[PDB]
Amino acid sequence: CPAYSXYLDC
Amino acid sequence: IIGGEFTTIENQPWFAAIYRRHRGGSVTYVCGGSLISPCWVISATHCFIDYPKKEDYIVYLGRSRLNSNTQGEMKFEVENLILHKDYSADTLAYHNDIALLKIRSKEGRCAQPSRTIQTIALPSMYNDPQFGTSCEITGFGKEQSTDYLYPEQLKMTVVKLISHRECQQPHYYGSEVTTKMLCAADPQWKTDSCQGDSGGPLVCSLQGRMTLTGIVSWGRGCALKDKPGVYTRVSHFLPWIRSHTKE
Ligand SMILES: N=C(N)N1CCCCC1
């Protein structure tokens, strides 16, 4: 449910 | 910057605007930075790591707008791009997210201080304000998570420093926050740094001196419940700074 900085929840 | 207010470069005369050339010749904004002396801008490694060649980058100082000129602005080439040897990027956080750009004009010149171009002071080592201290962030980053564009006009907002114990609680980021990082967020979670704000200044007034307390580094979405913004904790990198700037 992939998390990346910056953008959104997953 | 989510929420907050529009501003201009006189507010934040040390704010650096960093862009990257392309092959075709077009230029895109990368990240902010902060002018810590006439030849040196500080910023965040994660901004450069994927395209680490210095000749790719342009730095403007004196700039209040993203894609149009500001009267009095100065444009620099990147003479040295110094990325921290201990950088790492994990499933969430960036560690040691700090970078120094040595700037020099087509004329061979560093910055000339003006009403629109000033330097910001480095903290005292290991000296940071108390949790709950209100500090400012500045950037050309998104106004909303879902925006496709960056605002053309520079912004700023105020956030409050968060204690470590609070930030490292599993509710918030847990282990991901280290001692080399600072957290900050709005009590109602309604204002924050966002995409495109990375490498910009967290500025607090410790004593009476506007002081460069943090560098915008990372966080899950933007202005999100239990998810503060995370900033490189500048007062824990002084030796790295000066060692790489004594030259
Ligand atoms: N302030 C947080 N939410 N950020 C700042 C760094 C880029 C995106 C997430």
Side-chain angles (χ1 to χ4, degrees):
Chain A
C1 115
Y4 286 157
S5 181
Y7 195 26
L8 326 134
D9 222 40
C10 328
Chain B
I1 306 276
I2 311 306
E5 54 204 54
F6 281 103
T7 186
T8 56
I9 196 69
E10 297 82 352
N11 293 328
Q12 198 75 200
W14 48 80
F15 181 87
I18 303 172
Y19 309 69
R20 175 165 61 231
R21 314 182 154 124
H22 294 235
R23 292 314 300 302
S26 73
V27 162
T28 56
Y29 189 72
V30 177
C31 265
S34 291
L35 177 75
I36 50 163
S37 67
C39 305
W40 289 98
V41 161
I42 199 164
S43 191
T45 284
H46 88 259
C47 291
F48 305 102
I49 198 54
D50 295 351
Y51 301 83
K53 279 298 212 173
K54 58 181 185 185
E55 296 84 12
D56 291 0
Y57 295 101
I58 320 166
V59 179
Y60 287 81
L61 301 174
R63 185 135 178 148
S64 299
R65 290 188 67 84
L66 193 61
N67 289 295
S68 75
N69 303 135
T70 297
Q71 184 162 73
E73 60 174 31
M74 303 192 74
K75 159 178 183 185
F76 307 85
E77 301 307 321
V78 175
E79 184 189 332
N80 293 123
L81 180 54
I82 301 175
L83 304 185
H84 195 285
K85 279 263 148 50
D86 301 314
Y87 177 73
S88 84
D90 24 321
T91 208
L92 283 39
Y94 295 113
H95 286 80
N96 293 320
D97 203 2
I98 193 168
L100 285 144
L101 284 77
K102 175 163 165 95
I103 55 170
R104 183 187 75 93
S105 63
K106 198 242 131 192
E107 301 282 304
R109 310 227 204 201
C110 289
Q112 316 209 141
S114 75
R115 199 164 78 191
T116 70
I117 302 183
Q118 291 292 316
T119 65
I120 184 59
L122 288 165
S124 266
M125 64 184 196
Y126 274 76
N127 178 214
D128 300 304
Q130 332 53 247
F131 77 67
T133 299
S134 274
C135 312
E136 286 168 351
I137 45 171
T138 306
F140 290 117
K142 291 181 171 158
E143 303 204 78
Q144 314 181 276
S145 311
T146 56
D147 285 356
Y148 188 51
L149 300 165
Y150 293 161
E152 240 266 281
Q153 185 77 29
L154 189 65
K155 299 194 70 189
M156 68 188 309
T157 190
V158 163
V159 290
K160 303 185 190 232
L161 256 16
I162 297 188
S163 79
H164 262 257
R165 162 177 123 105
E166 184 186 343
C167 210
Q168 60 169 19
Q169 151 206 346
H171 216 200
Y172 284 28
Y173 295 126
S175 347
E176 222 35 71
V177 197
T178 68
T179 67
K180 284 169 151 192
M181 294 183 192
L182 286 174
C183 293
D186 173 90
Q188 290 247 8
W189 304 106
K190 84 158 157 103
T191 192
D192 204 3
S193 52
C194 201
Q195 190 175 23
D197 288 318
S198 277
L202 178 66
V203 177
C204 305
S205 147
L206 193 38
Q207 354 271 188
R209 221 48 211 201
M210 294 290 270
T211 289
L212 182 79
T213 301
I215 296 178
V216 183
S217 175
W218 67 273
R220 191 132 194 266
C222 311
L224 183 49
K225 180 111 206 274
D226 302 336
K227 310 302 169 226
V230 191
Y231 298 76
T232 300
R233 166 165 186 198
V234 178
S235 85
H236 287 47
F237 287 88
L238 298 191
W240 184 87
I241 287 162
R242 272 144 9 192
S243 81
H244 286 85
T245 52
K246 67 145 279 219
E247 58 138 305

